[PDB]
Write a protein that binds this ligand. Structure first.
Ligand SMILES: O=C(N[C@@H]1CCNC1)c1cc(-c2ccc(NS(=O)(=O)c3cccc(Cl)c3Cl)cc2)nc2n[nH]cc12
Length: 271
């Protein structure tokens, strides 16, 4: 019987919902419709045996928690249901995005990362699997840790080199992940990618970054800096979000209009 902070609805019980599909799994996430205002929600059920109030984590590009409740064995978090689907589902259809499109997504991710870092939070696991698109076309991040081999293929790796060789990591890992997510939007594959897992990990940890010729010098400088193996030399080490915010690549971004959703998304998902 954990107090669950102030987001607690002492009246809510799982009986108040209709659980359609299990949309995420590990502790899983479900799609459910409320039996009042017939509104669609995403409910994250965890399960007690998995042993920090917070939940004032409100950002335009992060999932919102409406309320939370508990049974006496399962833990439920009623979150916003995001309609537009994964961002990299759209990347698969097109192979790669143009720089204006990628700039918009990396700008929305950078401001959400900067906000998390101001709350002393580290995403650590920023994967395309966790980057969704709302019905209007804006970035909304999920799985930012608020609550919890193979020879070939192997699930793509976005973790910074220091995380891979179990070393002290900080907010700078998120700036590596931003560079990896951005590299993929531009080139079509995750950085250092190989079908051979041993080869891919060897690239990530010991091989210099291979930036191919068809991106602007601005994007190239940003990826070079964001994808720095040494966390002390990486973009974001000195003054976090402020270095990203001012970079040549984000010249066209008015950061105020960006957070106030006054910039039209470069694509609207048909929903
Ligand atoms: O479709 C989703 N996930 C699929 C599984 C991987 N590919 C996509 C999805 C997940 C969550 C979701 C996932 C993880 C979390 N994680 S959490 O720790 O960061 C968190 C954030 C904010 C408040 C709270 Cl209480 C929590 Cl626990 C929260 C929401 N929300 C959603 N809304 N609509 C869709 C949602």
């Amino acid at each position: 019987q954990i107090n669950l902070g102030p987001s607690s609805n002492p009246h809510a019980k799982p009986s108040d919902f209709h659980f359609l599909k299990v949309i995420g799994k590990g502790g899983k996430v479900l799609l459910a419709r409320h039996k009042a205002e017939e509104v669609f929600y995403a409910v994250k059920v965890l399960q007690k045996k998995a042993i920090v109030l917070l939940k004032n984590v409100k950002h335009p590009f992060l999932v919102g928690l409406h309320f939370s409740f508990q049974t006496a064995d399962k833990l439920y978090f009623v979150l916003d249901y995001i309609n537009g689907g994964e961002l990299f589902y759209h990347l698969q259809r097109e192979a790669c995005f143009l720089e204006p499109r990628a700039r918009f997504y990396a700008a929305e991710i950078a401001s959400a990362l900067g906000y998390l870092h101001s709350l002393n939070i580290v995403y650590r696991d920023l994967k395309p699997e966790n980057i969704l698109l709302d019905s209007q076309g804006h970035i909304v991040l999920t799985d930012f840790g608020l609550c919890k081999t193979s020879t070939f293929c192997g699930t793509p790796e976005y973790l910074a080199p220091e995380v891979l060789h179990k070393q002290p990591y900080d907010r700078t890992v998120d700036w590596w992940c931003l560079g990896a997510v951005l590299y993929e939007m531009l080139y079509g594959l995750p950085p250092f990618y190989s079908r051979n897992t041993a080869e891919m990990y060897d690239n990530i940890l010991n091989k210099p970054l291979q930036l191919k010729p068809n991106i602007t010098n601005s994007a190239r400088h940003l990826l070079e800096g964001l994808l720095q193996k040494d966390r002390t030399k990486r973009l974001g080490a000195k003054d976090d979000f402020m270095e990203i915010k001012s970079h040549v690549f984000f010249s066209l971004i008015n950061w105020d209009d960006l957070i106030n959703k006054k910039i039209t998304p470069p694509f609207n998902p048909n929903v």
